[PDB]
Design a protein around this ligand. Structure first.
Ligand code: NAD
Ligand code: NAD
Ligand code: NAD
Ligand code: NAD
Lengths: 336, 336, 336, 336
């Protein structure tokens, strides 16, 4: 029998993690918690605007919903500490609500009976922040709370690591041209968090916004802590994003071909490499955490001084989710 | 000195009502209530994605904000019954939160000290529902709570009235191809009201939805109560909407020219008439409650049996708001 | 060996017909003609914004491109009469350029050597217009030029037939809320055809437009010729469309349940039936020609007089394409 | 009497240039040329998706259209060399077709009888490239063909000049997150220029693309020739754009406040300054060629090595047009 997973917050990441977990043996979602009725949950699992119809069968049943014959218990409890995790034998909670993004707060799940908690976002507190295939080996299995970092962090980390390992990273600035997300308002309206830019119509604007991804890349790659920073422009695509990274390197006389070859060599199931002139919708549903795009590599040289820019695609939904589920699996396998 | 208006809910309609009130003498907004800080409020008044920069000067001051030298007191009180309306001499509350859409609930403003309440939506309970220039003369000045109807009701009313007055309305069905609004989710997510369609990405879908507009047109035009019904398709424009009305008329041998001439004759500052082949973005900001579009008139005749279809544009924002503020002005003038 | 297909115009419908043909045994595309280089053709086959990555392998070769090991000859010839159809043994041309939508013009392919021509649109001239599973049996195999009708015609036909067969169709009007297409301008600009509405920014507007679908439904269902008419509102989704049909029926005391059951009974691989509260993106990629949506049925009754409204979803792209390919297959099978 | 202007290509820039010219005394548009009928031209002048209704009156007359009582002659001649510029006394052609972007080609207008040509784009050949208020004083009045550079170049120039003048520009890389434009396809289709990216659905994608803006900034600012490079991401807003510039400076220990103060001091009617948290739709219609946005300034410092990033907004339409008309006015004034 599988590792028993409970998803807290059946949102974009929660539901896609659910879908992704269907295709990973030894992981089962036995429970889902949100703030809504079961008809809504089943409906949002079946139908997904950007990610497509769920392929299996979804049925509403007493106390939850059944997916391909398998019963998922569901709950409507805003306070995680009151969830029946001890009774259900939860091995790991995928904390995907956006409201427990901190070690202390996530501990609610451990009190409620979960053995571990993996947060679908950056989190404050004394915990590890993990981008799979960049630093997942920093896990030893004894962690009770882990962060899977952010989508952007997952797109950035393998890129920054190659730049650092192969060229020496001096410093850099990043912009992610990022799809709009649920914390953005549909029409211009007050924003819960006081952000005057997330306050504006999501799908009608280029919207500058913050992110920690680059500032907190040091949590994932300690040897470059403090060397990156940058922000985001939220733009009107519902999913699919691009990280542009502009860097100063230690190596001199760096060429486009050298940067690209180095990226290619470091490719794996988390870090994709393409030379095709693709655009954002081509990466919707992709399971790479980061797709390095060699067509966008630039090297500006003035005398002995070089700036190097690179760009990596990610589906800020599915790319992140696939990374999150890998980390989940690995976290489980090490714990047993 | 002016009629003293308080806007409850500085939302899309609230803020646009504020802007529209700036250009109507004898009306002042002296107070605004919402659920946010003053920086947000001032910012959302200044900048508006679809409706353009606010032309005057907006400044944050102690206890509110100043618009062109005029002080607006602001509040952060989700329970209307606790607002200082008595102390401020509120003559009318523009109820624009979407949460007091019922005579009894809106009564909280009366208890708080407001003389009158006008609700920016259809509302249940023993009150009048008013589309300016279609039934505003049903007001006598003694009403304490009034509904300004919906945007769709305001687009539909003058059209249905002409159809009825001039041709006899037997029955009809309506569809409004309607811009998305703030009650719709940015990304597929749980919907507060359990509506599986309003739950979906607002700007990425054709989304079928309900409305009362047609079913409750009887509140505005009693002589055609129960003769209309229909729904909405929410589509990805951030504002600007079209109402398509398909009717069976008692008059025989009706022609396109007849329908069109009849609409033109009935035109005023609430009901515009056009023969130009416009599209939705051409009516953004317009102050007609309803723009009859003659180019879309159709008459299908099979023997003696005719179906007649017409279409009317409205800016679900500014068109409704202009109607609302006319009704507010009139309600005030009759009260004195 | 398969029926030998040439696709003229590797556009939206051309490429999707290509994809669809890959999964239908006894049909092969041996030739493609457009107005561009092979790199472009291959690229647009591989990547598709709304329809997803092509699953197989696509490679540019000398004189064309190779798909999963199979060679496709390609051409760049604007005058179809000059195509090497005789030399290539073309059994059927999928005419998908939008520029040969007439029997006489399409004859260019017969002169160039193709045995038959099937047009991806309504076409003038002495030829048959075919919606698969509604009137495809009107084909005997001796036709040299055939039209596959339009996307709208395919969504409307099975619906209209069931209304007529089961209830008696007196008359009706139709609106399709339709995704924007390639003959719509990106930004407001002159339009090649003089259409002041198709001239406007496709993805920023609700745009009223014509269609023949309903006026020429008589070509597909002769027994209701002249009884339907209507138009379109083009809206900003890149694909996925909805047909609303409002009708007068002969049968009295018709209920929603009756209309819905009658539609359900008529369902097949061309005509789907759903009771789920889906939205346009849920039909992207679907292969039904028409998805009847029971949640949108309405019956308006005033005394003895009834209006009945129904709505059917279609992917104006894939739904039409799947229909087109079925008709192509059938046309081939009857010819041999 | 005014400088007699003829607009070649009544497109986005052409029509907006027309509108802008209505509010600049001593400039008249007496003639317009495009590839379409007068009804379309007049319609597209009246109605504008992003830029709003034309305020004055537009009327179709014999041989052109009348704007506020003033006759504009119109033509339908793809070959500029055949235009009746001698007969009409054209002082300056605003070359806005996108098809004459080269000194030699634009010379067709001089042969046709125009005294001068100003091109609404970067242009090859022996001519000056002008960004108003950055290098317009490089004009002496004897030029017959001039380029007004690109929208991006206009947003970047005043920024780059300040960085250079005040800090010493070593090198930099730029990204413009740019609104989609008319040479982008509506749906994925072959692209006239073989660009596999401009080939994609303009409003559904983040689309990487080239620009010369930065590489040819050296035409406008010769003292920094060859020190900048960069590209674009076309995203789904219909207008309004942001230029991010990441730079290495000679001055050490630069702060955010220094960069911002430096930008503020250089502000004028071409180069605006804001500290407001605006978004793209807030700059639609603005007449600054560049709006420097202080909220986005970043300085990354690792020991003694700094990267400085800044961003300036521009309405790629109206910002560019306003700059183009300023350069037109000035070019005329010096010529007389
Ligand atoms: N959308 C993305 O690109 C993306 C990518 C990576 C990481 N993330 C992170 O994942 C988290 C969620 O993001 P999302 O886009 O899935 O958001 P979402 O809003 O789609 O989903 C959050 C869900 O949590 C539910 N919820 C809220 N409070 C709850 C409570 N206390 N108890 C139970 N359920 C509750 C909501 O009802 C909602 O369904 C955030 O921290 C976010 O930053 C998002
Ligand atoms: N938007 C339209 O096109 C449209 C048209 C006509 C009528 N309406 C109606 O107007 C009302 C508001 O619409 P909107 O589009 O402006 O929505 P919105 O979300 O912009 O406005 C809601 C505003 O009210 C505030 N609010 C919510 N609860 C509150 C509380 N109890 N106390 C104080 N403030 C509170 C919110 O913070 C927000 O500012 C709804 O009834 C809606 O149906 C909307
Ligand atoms: N939803 C839809 O877009 C859809 C659905 C049903 C039917 N149709 C019809 O099918 C046809 C094609 O539709 P589409 O959207 O795929 O077209 P499209 O705009 O994508 O382009 C069709 C292709 O024809 C090519 N072509 C090849 N030879 C040509 C020549 N001789 N002249 C002109 N073009 C040539 C063009 O380059 C283009 O790639 C049209 O008749 C259309 O109305 C489209
Ligand atoms: N943001 C912008 O759209 C923008 C900004 C700066 C510069 N520009 C540049 O200005 C130019 C115009 O751009 P646009 O956006 O207005 O393009 P557009 O397609 O909107 O307008 C081009 C117009 O020229 C017409 N035309 C008239 N005579 C022609 C002929 N002889 N041959 C070919 N076409 C003819 C076309 O019908 C069309 O209306 C291009 O160089 C473009 O790069 C565009």
């Amino acid at each position: 029998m599988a590792v028993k997973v409970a998803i807290n917050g059946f949102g974009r990441i929660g539901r896609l993690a659910f879908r992704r977990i269907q295709e990973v043996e030894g992981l089962e979602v036995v429970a889902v918690n949100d703030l809504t009725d079961d008809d809504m949950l089943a409906h949002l699992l079946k139908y997904d605007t950007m990610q497509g119809r769920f392929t299996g069968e979804v049925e509403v049943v007493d106390g939850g919903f059944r997916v391909n014959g398998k019963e998922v218990k569901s709950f409507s409890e805003p306070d995680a500490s009151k969830l029946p995790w001890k009774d259900l034998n939860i091995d790991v909670v995928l904390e995907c609500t956006g409201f427990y993004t901190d070690k202390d707060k996530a501990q609610a799940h451990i009190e409620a009976g979960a053995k571990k908690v993996l947060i679908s976002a950056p989190a404050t507190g004394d915990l590890k922040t993990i981008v799979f295939n960049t630093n997942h080996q920093e896990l030893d299995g004894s962690e009770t709370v882990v962060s899977g970092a952010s989508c952007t962090t997952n797109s950035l980390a393998p890129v920054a690591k190659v730049l650092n390992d192969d060229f020496g990273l001096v410093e850099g600035l990043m912009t992610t041209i990022h799809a709009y997300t649920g914390d953005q308002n549909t029409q211009d309206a007050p924003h819960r968090k006081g952000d005057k830019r997330r306050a504006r119509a999501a799908a009608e604007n280029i919207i500058p916004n913050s992110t920690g991804a680059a500032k907190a890349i040091g949590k994932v790659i300690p040897e470059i802590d403090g060397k990156l920073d940058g922000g985001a422009q939220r733009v009107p695509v519902a999913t699919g994003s691009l990280t542009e990274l502009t860097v100063v390197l230690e190596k001199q006389d760096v060429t486009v071909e050298q940067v690209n070859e180095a990226m290619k060599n470091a490719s794996n199931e988390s870090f994709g490499y393409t030379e095709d002139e693709i655009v954002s919708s081509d990466v919707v549903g992709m399971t790479y955490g980061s797709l390095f795009d060699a067509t966008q590599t630039r090297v500006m040289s003035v005398g002995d001084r070089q700036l190097v820019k690179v760009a990596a695609w990610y589906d800020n939904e599915m790319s992140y989710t696939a990374q999150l589920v890998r980390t989940l699996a690995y976290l489980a396998e090490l714990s047993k």
